[PDB]
């Protein structure tokens, strides 16, 4: 049964290599998106720094996960934050994004998930797909009326130094009357506050989804990488056992044949 173990580990290693190639293919696009998305969000963040855009105070619960079903700690860490939010704010509506986050959000509170959209992590973060997702969110159940909304989003530092970290969003009320919003002026006719809330949600969502897709592609290159290491170690051990077993079998055969003679 050692031979079947070695060959099955070898097959798992081949499958892991194929998954690594798929990870590279998806990670190229995820990084390509995140590169521009980070700057896009920093553009409106400059305003949120130009005007201290602290939001005070029906409050949604969100998470970051692409269209894959967990990779090491890609879905688990976000699920823990989702359960913590469910405990803290049971009456908090959930935005079920992708599949793994969709399944995790459907797990805790049936009355929280207000949307169930799948396959968000199809490819790189696209501006139009993210924008349409937000516009639907900005139209579903008055998520703009949601006084506060925390984005429990991945913060991949370099490779996997992340969890679904929580951040605030400057909404329609919190944009116009920010304490340092006196710095940047708005127009009564232009209706700045609503548009600033929507666009802040847009930039934050695009940047966060791009970072999360990049981080899960990392989980497809930093969790399967650990699995590839495990397969290498198991394969070396099994190869040692089989090479020793074959040699010992041949030796015992020679010994038996001579001992017969």
């Amino acid at each position: 049964e050692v031979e079947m173990r070695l060959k099955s580990i070898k097959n798992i290693e081949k499958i892991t290599k194929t998954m690594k190639i798929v990870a590279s293919t998806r990670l190229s696009k995820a990084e390509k998106a995140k590169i521009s998305a980070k700057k896009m969000d920093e553009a409106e963040q400059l305003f949120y720094k130009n005007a201290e855009t602290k939001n005070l105070d029906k409050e949604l619960i969100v998470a970051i996960t692409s269209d894959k079903g967990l990779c090491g700690s890609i879905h688990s860490q976000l699920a823990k934050a989702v359960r913590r939010h469910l405990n803290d704010q049971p009456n908090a509506d959930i935005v079920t994004i992708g599949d793994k986050i969709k399944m995790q959000l459907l797990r805790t509170h049936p009355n929280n998930i207000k949307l169930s959209i799948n396959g968000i992590g199809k490819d790189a973060p696209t501006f139009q797909e993210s924008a349409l997702i937000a516009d639907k969110l900005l139209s579903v159940m008055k998520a703009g009326t949601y006084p506060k909304i925390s984005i429990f989003y991945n913060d991949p530092v370099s490779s996997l130094s992340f969890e679904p970290s929580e951040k605030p969003i400057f909404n329609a009320k919190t944009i116009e009357q920010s304490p340092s919003f006196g710095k940047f002026e708005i127009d009564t006719d232009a209706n700045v506050p609503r548009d600033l809330f929507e666009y802040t949600l847009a930039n934050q969502m695009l940047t966060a989804m791009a970072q999360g897709y990049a981080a899960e592609i990392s989980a497809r290159r930093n969790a399967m990488d650990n699995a590839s290491k495990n397969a290498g170690d198991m394969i070396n051990r099994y190869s040692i056992l089989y090479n020793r077993t074959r040699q010992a079998v041949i030796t015992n055969e020679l010994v038996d044949i001579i001992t017969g003679a």
């Binding site: 521009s36 700057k39 896009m40 553009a43 400059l46 501006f127 924008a131 847009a202 930039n203 695009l206």
Partner: peptide
């Protein structure tokens, strides 16, 4: 100027 659109900065 920070012209960084959600497509390509």
């Amino acid at each position: 100027l920070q012209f960084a659109l959600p497509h390509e900065t």
